[PDB]
Amino acid sequence: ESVKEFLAKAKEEFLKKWESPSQNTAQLDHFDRIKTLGTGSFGRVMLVKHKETGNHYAMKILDKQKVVKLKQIEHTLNEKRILQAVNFPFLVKLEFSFKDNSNLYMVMEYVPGGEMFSHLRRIGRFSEPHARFYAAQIVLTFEYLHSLDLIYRDLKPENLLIDQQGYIQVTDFGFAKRVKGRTWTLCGTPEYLAPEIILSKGYNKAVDWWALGVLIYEMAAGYPPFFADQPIQIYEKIVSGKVRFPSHFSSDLKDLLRNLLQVDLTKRFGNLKNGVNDIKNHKWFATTDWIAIYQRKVEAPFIPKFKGPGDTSNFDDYEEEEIRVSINEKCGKEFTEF
Numbered sequence: 001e002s003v004k005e006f007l008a009k010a011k012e013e014f015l016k017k018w019e020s021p022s023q024n025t026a027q028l029d030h031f032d033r034i035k036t037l038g039t040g041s042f043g044r045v046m047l048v049k050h051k052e053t054g055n056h057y058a059m060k061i062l063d064k065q066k067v068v069k070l071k072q073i074e075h076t077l078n079e080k081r082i083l084q085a086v087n088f089p090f091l092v093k094l095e096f097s098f099k100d101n102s103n104l105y106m107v108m109e110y111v112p113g114g115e116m117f118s119h120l121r122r123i124g125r126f127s128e129p130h131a132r133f134y135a136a137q138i139v140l141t142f143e144y145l146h147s148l149d150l151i152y153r154d155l156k157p158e159n160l161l162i163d164q165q166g167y168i169q170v171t172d173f174g175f176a177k178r179v180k181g182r183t184w185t186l187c188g189t190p191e192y193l194a195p196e197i198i199l200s201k202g203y204n205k206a207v208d209w210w211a212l213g214v215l216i217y218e219m220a221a222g223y224p225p226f227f228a229d230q231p232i233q234i235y236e237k238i239v240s241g242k243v244r245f246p247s248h249f250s251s252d253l254k255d256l257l258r259n260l261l262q263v264d265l266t267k268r269f270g271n272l273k274n275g276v277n278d279i280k281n282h283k284w285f286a287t288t289d290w291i292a293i294y295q296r297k298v299e300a301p302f303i304p305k306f307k308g309p310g311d312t313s314n315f316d317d318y319e320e321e322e323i324r325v326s327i328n329e330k331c332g333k334e335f336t337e338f
């Protein structure tokens with residue numbers, strides 16, 4: 001009942017913000033730009049500093065014209081509407097949002113420890129206790145998101161930032177969506193796609209649990225289970241129903257992964273009658289104090305090295321491009337609700 005009442009309040013609070021989203025809560029010249037932290041086909045993330053408070057933030061900047069051309073309008077409206085409505089210890093907090101003639105802006109907390117991906121590639125692979133600590137946070141986060149009828153759809157090490165306490169902060173909700181029932185969009189990253197996405201089926205939250213299997217495998221092995229030079233070859237391996245495990249994997253880890261990497265979505269852990277509890281009660285998680293993880297009372301496997309809230313050393317170097325704002329409004333109709 002404690003979990004039921006927790007999730008009921010979580011949904012109440014989400015729905016109130018979902019039905020009346022915040023809009024236009026800062027403007028660009030409230031900030032100084034410091035450094036580009038990442039770049040994509042239609043957007044960027046920049047470290048910025050608020051000029052009055054001195055606080056640092058990660059500012060996601062999306063080019064409206066490029067969003068339209070890459071057919072990401074609905075997805076970018078999803079991302080902002082969801083981010084301004086959610087609240088969970090392992091989700092990056094949105095602090096401000098606004099738009100101008102050219103761009104959409106989402107200003108969120110800056111997490112200086114960097115992407116899990118960098119740390120995983122630096123060390124090679126995580127020990128099972130280390131992987132399990134992160135996995136437990138994703139399990140709780142998906143329990144939260146799925147109870148709100150939200151599917152995340154982009155789980156991968158690059159989207160998991162490590163904070164000052166060594167805990168995960170999930171970022172990039174660009175593919176997240178509120179879904180009652182099925183949805184159909186081809187999106188994600190090839191190595192993490194569930195078979196039913198590859199096969200163009202109407203799919204559901206079970207794709208997140210498949211991706212968790214991929215993530216746990218990758219954290220514990222150092223590489224994902226389905227790897228190939230071309231996406232088509234990755235997809236053939238994903239749908240095959242065959243995975244090989246390193247001998248150093250524990251038997252419990254292999255058993256959990258076989259049930260998360262279940263190609264038949266109707267047999268996949270997280271999608272059975274007991275839902276998330278088939279995962280939480282699995283022997284691989286026997287040492288996990290779920291409440292202590294939620295309360296952030298467990299000592300983390302490591303704390304990232306950084307000097308302070310403005311340190312960018314755990315992110316990499318990109319060409320610094322202008323934040324140009326047209327004299328004329330672009331795509332106003334498409335982004336009215338942003």
Ligand SMILES: N=C(N)c1ccncc1
Pocket residue numbers: 037038045058060092108109110111112161171172
């Ligand atoms: N890539 C990001 N959205 C990000 C968020 C927070 N801190 C750093 C990066």
Ligand SMILES: N=C(N)c1ccncc1
Pocket residue numbers: 286287288289290
């Ligand atoms: N003390 C623990 N590790 C613990 C394990 C499972 N459930 C609660 C606590």
